[PDB]
Design a protein around this ligand. Structure first.
Ligand SMILES: OCCSc1nc2ccccc2[nH]1
Ligand SMILES: OCCSc1nc2ccccc2[nH]1
Lengths: 546, 546
């Protein structure tokens, strides 16, 4: 039975094949057919290209040797190369033009999810060109999705040499009949076949995938749309900043570019952004996914007053100070969405751009106390259950697995009703002991939340709801202001607590506000509709935040 | 006795005073004298500017109100404002033109070093302009050097209102006669004077500093050149990446921009770059200062083989992978300098640019084993003392404070002689029990190194010297290569182990190599000559790395 799938890079995982630019160049310049391909392979094993692929020389050292080979071939063919001929120019264009073959990567990702060991085996070079970063970025994006990356220039061996296949088998810890090997070069498939490996000659992706699906017996073509890449906690960069003597903030960090600070809601974690972190980094941003104060690896002091909006925002500013960041784009959800609007109102010089998922911006009413506002707004009735220190803590902390399984549900999964919480005496009074697992999460993901909440529990998180009056007084100071920095409001159709219509008057205070809207999306936006969230955020980031 | 020094921002810590652009604009446009200054202060406490300074409105909300005031004033003066008149344009130019008054900051830094509590008290605004980042950057750089930053727009009070001075006294926890208050606005000094504070009216910095020096009795003018800003470990962002099951890498992170990975030598720490970290971040770079494998908070496995160049470089690549970084500029010193040359040779696609302090690049001799090379090169004799597992560990671990105090010396401080180490049986046989403290370090800095080395000791660090043959075999694979990416070699005149002449043939292998050279500098480059190191690195980074 097959248990490993091996992919070539050029012409298989990446297209157009850099190799194929030689052919296109010949035709575009009306040079003899095969002239450039012949100069490329000149000398075979003893040649310049083999030395390059084995790692003996770098790509910049190879270019002049390739030029001499082109000159030799043209002389023998009795043709002239045009005056502006440049191997560097041809290869820069070719490499930069080459992109990930998304359907091939999708198939590799599927096989890996089904228990296959996956690997990339490629004849590649040491790239020291001024423009090498483009290739480095491509290799980075691709390689993360595989168990092994075997580069000829690193192992000092090349396909079609037999030792590289023995090397591949050794790294896979697999016998040849357990391996499917995909390559676009028939000569490079032959040694894999000779050992008894299943081989696929890749021309068009579709036929290659049909052959692959048939041999593995796993559906790879016409598959449902896959979810965005998630995060494995143990594989992330974990950052820690002390903002004040007793308070430290934890964050996960990925990517390069403008800083994007992700602020989760109640009762969540940095992990609620798992589907956003890889996509935003890939989009050219430096992501900082927070464990907000009271959560996960961040400090959780007991005092209610430590969780008022004024102190929480102050600490986020210190956070930027300590990291040496003059600004960051702030993206928040739920309680984090409330915090991000306040960062825009109080610290606009530190906020590159602001985006909120579900949480609307509603100015404080100076003529009505928060108790009175809730009296006039019964949808927020349950928040009075969160008020008394210890009551909601005891219910939420009783059974952690039941807590997360009850809360984290899609709109059609019998979501907890927030109406009647006070009348009924708790969040879960009409909830089962052993809730079913929502399609949004795996059991493992639930256990991650359970493990995180074992450290500090629900006290610090519930404290975010315990500063109504303090937050109201501070918010009233900002009543004459308007939010004039770049801003995005993302509404979720089926969030019954943070309803889209609650955001309807936002333009009065944020005139240049941009909007996004997600259909059939409940409260847990990021995991409910990850693909849609990613598309809305990236589009807005690229146009408005930079 | 005075114990607190308070500085205004505009016209005091920062110049030219944004305030003074109103005067220059009047003259440049030949408008009536004081016209723009009069429209700026129109309405006094009830006016638009006071509302802006108290934080009632933002800078973008204020601009049109300032325009109306200019129109009113010009109408009363019977003049016309030119057609292209723009308050936004005037203020963008003014704010961006304003820089830190370096001699004033130097004086504040000196007073703070001498035990003074320092603070910035400023009438400022909430900046929501598209170009707000410039001001945010300025505030960031300035504020880090002070105990308190009190901004009028944040406290809802302004100078010259008496409550702000009472607020200042409260935050300082000081009585008025213990405070020196510096301002360029005489009206804003008056309430401080009225309370009994020492006040200085700032016109030209020099006279202001003479008055300040006289009153504090502390030399502030004509002072020796100060050292660059250092790092306080508890104030940094600490990052941790797991590169493989048993190996985690710790790093300190500061700033935004291109990633600059700093790689220390033997037997050091991330902290050896303390004078480089703030300066490089300020220069527009994202600094990642490593605890190399075997050191500080990074893992220290016992196996010799874990410290060969091939595995160390592989782990640094994984480090970039896990952080989502396609590249980084690699700057190394001593053992880190050796590692960075190997990163350039083996992973050029991941190395933006490469710089080494003291460590030359010398290709492996394939016709001579490392033992033989050392036999032909007696300056490296002492390295044979490092070979036997446990011998050098016992001597270096016996007394940690003596170890660091003996090693970390400037060129004129009776530096340990590396000649005769084998003959004599140890590094410190002719060294005192209680070495004097080098001028390069404080006692506290020594104790930081002592505390770091208590965790894993000297085994993992000494293991870097225990892979001569393994490193030689791997280096021989790169013999046909040349380093063609941007490269900088920095030599130190008085390093008697990594001597400048050892780098003389580097151009044969690194044709486009750029150089730096530091006179009267010993082995401990970063702390020996921090100002010079910073200038060389920044100049090279800005021209060659981006
Ligand atoms: O204003 C943002 C907080 S609203 C809110 N988010 C929740 C998540 C879970 C249960 C009740 C909640 N109420
Ligand atoms: O090739 C880089 C290592 S050379 C070297 N660095 C040292 C620091 C302290 C003592 C001996 C040393 N030898």
């Amino acid at each position: 039975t097959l248990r490993a799938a091996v992919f070539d890079l050029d012409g298989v995982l990446a297209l157009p094949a850099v190799f194929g630019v030689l052919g296109r160049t010949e035709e575009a310049l009306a040079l003899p057919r095969g002239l450039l391909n012949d100069a490329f392979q000149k000398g075979g094993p003893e040649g310049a290209t083999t030395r390059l692929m084995k790692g003996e020389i770098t790509l910049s050292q190879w270019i002049p040797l390739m030029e001499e080979n082109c000159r030799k071939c043209s002389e023998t063919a009795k043709v002239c190369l045009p005056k502006n001929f440049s191997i560097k120019e041809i290869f820069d264009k070719a490499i930069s033009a080459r992109k990930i073959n998304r359907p091939m990567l999708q198939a590799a990702l599927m096989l890996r999810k089904k228990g296959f060991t996956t690997a990339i085996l490629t004849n590649t070079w040491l790239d020291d060109r001024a423009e090498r970063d483009g290739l480095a970025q491509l290799m980075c994006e691709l390689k993360m999705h595989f168990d092994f990356l075997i580069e000829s220039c690193q192992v000092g061996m090349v396909k079609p040499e037999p030792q590289i296949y023995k090397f591949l088998l050794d790294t896979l810890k697999a016998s040849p009949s357990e391996v499917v090997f995909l390559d676009d070069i028939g000569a490079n498939l032959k040694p894999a076949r000779d050992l008894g490996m299943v081989t696929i000659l890749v021309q068009d992706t579709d036929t290659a995938l049909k052959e692959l699906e048939k041999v593995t017996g796993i559906q790879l073509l016409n598959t449902p749309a896959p979810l965005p890449t998630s995060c494995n906690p143990s594989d992330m960069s974990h950052g820690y900043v002390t903002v004040k003597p007793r308070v430290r903030l934890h964050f996960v960090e990925l990517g390069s570019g403008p800083a994007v600070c992700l602020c989760h809601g109640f009762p969540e974690s940095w992990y609620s952004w798992r589907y956003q972190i890889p996509a935003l980094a890939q989009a050219g941003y430096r992501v900082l996914a927070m464990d907000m104060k009271g959560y996960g690896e961040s400090s959780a002091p007991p005092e209610i007053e430590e969780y008022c909006m004024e102190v929480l925002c102050k600490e986020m500013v210190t956070f930027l100070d300590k990291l040496g960041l003059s600004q960051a784009v702030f993206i928040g959800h739920d309680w984090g969405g409330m915090l991000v609007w306040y960062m825009a109102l109080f610290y606009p010089e530190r906020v590159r751009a602001v985006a909120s998922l579900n949480t609307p911006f509603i100015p404080a009413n100076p003529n009505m106390s928060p108790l009175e506002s809730i009296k006039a707004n019964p949808v927020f009735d349950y928040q009075l259950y969160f008020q008394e220190p210890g009551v909601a803590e005891a219910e939420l902390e009783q059974n952690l697995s039941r807590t997360f399984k009850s809360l984290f549900r899609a709109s059609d999964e019998s979501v907890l009703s927030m109406h009647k919480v006070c009348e009924a005496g708790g969040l879960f009074v009409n909830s089962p002991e052993e809730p079913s697992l929502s399609r949004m999460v795996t059991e493992e993901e639930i256990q991650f939340y359970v493990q995180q909440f074992k450290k500090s529990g629900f006290r610090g998180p519930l404290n975010w709801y315990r500063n109504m009056e303090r937050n109201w007084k501070w918010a009233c100071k900002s009543l004459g202001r308007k939010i004039l920095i770049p801003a995005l409001m993302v509404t979720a159709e089926k969030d019954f607590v943070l309803v889209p219509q609650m955001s309807q008057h936002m333009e009065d205070w944020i005139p240049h506000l941009k909007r996004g809207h997600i259909e059939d999306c409940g409260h847990w936006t990021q995991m409910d509709k990850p693909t849609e969230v990613n598309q809305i955020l990236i589009k807005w980031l690229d146009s408005d935040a930079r």
